[PDB]
Amino acid sequence: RPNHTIYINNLNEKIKKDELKKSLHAIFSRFGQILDILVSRSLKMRGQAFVIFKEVSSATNALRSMQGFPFYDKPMRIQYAKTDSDIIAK
RNA sequence: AAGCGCCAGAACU
RNA sequence: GGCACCAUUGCACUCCGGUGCCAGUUGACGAGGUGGGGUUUAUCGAGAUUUCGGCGGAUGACUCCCGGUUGUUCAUCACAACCGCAAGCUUUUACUUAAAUCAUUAAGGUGACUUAGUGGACAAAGGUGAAAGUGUGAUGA
Ligand SMILES: O=P(O)(O)OC[C@H]1O[C@H](O)[C@H](O)[C@@H](O)[C@@H]1O
Ligand SMILES: [Mg+2]
Ligand SMILES: [Mg+2]
Ligand SMILES: [Mg+2]
Ligand SMILES: [Mg+2]
């Protein structure tokens, strides 16, 4: 179902952790207030992100508008997160 | 300101 | 930490697949010490993940040569042990700021770590002064 956090994958792996967190705060700021973007570069989490919006409504507009968007030469793939992130739980 | 300086191994990022 | 390649299309709150090539970082805490030449693996303790491993210095040690001191006062040659603006040996005696580690808390840095402050201590060698003992002979004098 719908969620506060959108799971983004198919992102370019060659890009550093910190500059990516700012590169997709540059785009997803349009849809609403972003709390924290979580990005790793490990074998598991290589080329995927978890952008956390304040409101769910913003995450839906983000999924609708940014689906298939070419970002670092690669079209983004956005799904809703399977579970709630441990910052919305509070 | 001379147990002082440097950094090729090693170790850690 | 960073580029190239290999492999990965995937739900997470102390980092975290692999090799290669770079890059960065750590890599001695104070005390002490220089007549000249040779020789050599260069003094003292503190700490305890590398203060390890490598290279460079270096005031060490010995050994000779040079120059001295002391050997009861001032002089020459021996000899003896010393010393390199100090100087025979023994017996005793104050001065001789340790600094890091430790603990802590700010600053910078992506991070490894770095700078600095604060708290409190704890050395050895050395050296510099008391004092009692004591150490030549010849030659002149
Ligand atoms: O300590 P090393 O890396 O062996 O270096 C050699 C010398 O280093 C320093 O100079 C020390 O004061 C000497 O005591 C030591 O002989
Ligand atoms: Mg030092
Ligand atoms: Mg010193
Ligand atoms: Mg060394
Ligand atoms: Mg050496």
Rounded CA-CA distance A23/A83 in Å is 25
Angle at A19 between CA A23 and CA A66, to 5 degrees: 25
Which method was used?
Answer: X-ray
CB atoms within 10 A of CB A23: 18
Q: Which residues touch strand C (CB under 7 A)?
A: A 5, 7, 9-10, 13-14, 16-18, 38, 40-48, 50, 77, 79-83, 85-86
Instruction: Output the 3-class SS for chain A.
Output: CCCCEEEEECCCCCCCHHHHHHHCHHHHCCCCCEEEEEECCCCCCCCCEEEEECCHHHHHHHHHHHCCCEECCEECEEEECCCCCCCCCC
Q: Which two tokens mark A13?
A: 């792996």
- Nearest nucleotide to A10 (CA to C1') is C9
Domains observed in chain A: 1-90 (3.30.70.330)
Resolution in angstroms for this experimental structure? 2.8
What are the residues whose beta carbons fall under 8 Å from the beta carbon of A70, sequence distance 6 or more? A76
